Design a protein around this ligand. Sequence first.
Ligand SMILES: Nc1ncnc2c1ncn2[C@@H]1O[C@H](COP(=O)(O)OP(=O)(O)OC[C@H]2O[C@H](O)[C@H](O)[C@@H]2O)[C@@H](O)[C@H]1O
Ligand SMILES: O=C1Nc2ccccc2C1=O
Ligand SMILES: [Cl-]
Ligand SMILES: [Zn+2]
Length: 285
Amino acid sequence: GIDPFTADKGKCGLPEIFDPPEELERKVWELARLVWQSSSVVFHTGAGISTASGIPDFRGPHGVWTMEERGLAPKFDTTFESARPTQTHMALVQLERVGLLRFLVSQNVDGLHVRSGFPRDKLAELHGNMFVEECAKCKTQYVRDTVVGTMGLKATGRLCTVACRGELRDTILDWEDSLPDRDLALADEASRNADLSITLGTSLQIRPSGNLPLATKRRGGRLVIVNLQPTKHDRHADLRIHGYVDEVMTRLMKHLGLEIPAWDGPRVLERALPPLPRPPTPKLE
Ligand SMILES: Nc1ncnc2c1ncn2[C@@H]1O[C@H](COP(=O)(O)OP(=O)(O)OC[C@H]2O[C@H](O)[C@H](O)[C@@H]2O)[C@@H](O)[C@H]1O
Ligand SMILES: O=C1Nc2ccccc2C1=O
Ligand SMILES: [Cl-]
Ligand SMILES: [Zn+2]
């Protein structure tokens, strides 16, 4: 249940850029330097961090919209339910736990940030979550083990169980639907206050999601864009890294002296913990 018409789907199928190995290694060291220098690092994720799980993106060579425009179908190598979080998903978990990530803003509805164990009080799911239904009455969210089987904020069939019997609805925005105010305000506040915003596997074409990383540049914030394709705001990036995000984040975590933790299977953390110990910072200047 995903539209093909009145939706303007932006620029789809643009060519991939691969930074050569020596330029990729230098840029990821510079990204390391930037994380180390930064008080407040906000990460922005889109469908490119889930491609290495089997979930096709929207506008890449084999993206959903790209393939529809040529009369082909996207291909899933997994169900949403059987999808494992990527090395990128798990790198972001560890960065939050060691206190190097202040906030995570995601356009992804694939539910993997949440199932990765990422604290929900540091995550904005701007476009909703396949696995999350919300009570129309009391706004209580339920994180389910299977995808909520509707889209576009419709009644799911189930009712609220809060000590309510309220109508349960999906959280998946249709084209016409506004972003959730709570998530967008927190994403917006995190982004304005950030001194570093790193975008991972998003083409930044969708307002207001794809403009949030620009809000960081106000007050002299740094923007880094990791993406295989061009992005709407490449021009405003202090650093563009054209590589597989799993390679970039695996080399970055190596430079930061951080391990990428194991995924235990689907777990839900509501609230972030005080940060875990982290390695001491290199002398930079
Ligand atoms: N492994 C990878 N490493 C790096 N970049 C990657 C990888 N795989 C894909 N990419 C890049 O990943 C980028 C992903 O860009 P898009 O496909 O536009 O997805 P969005 O998250 O911005 O979609 C925004 C909304 O639009 C939709 O309608 C929905 O509402 C979405 O929520 C591409 O440029 C790829 O080159
Ligand atoms: O990545 C995705 N591809 C899709 C195709 C159909 C419905 C939802 C999605 C996604 O979230
Ligand atoms: Cl599925
Ligand atoms: Zn309720």
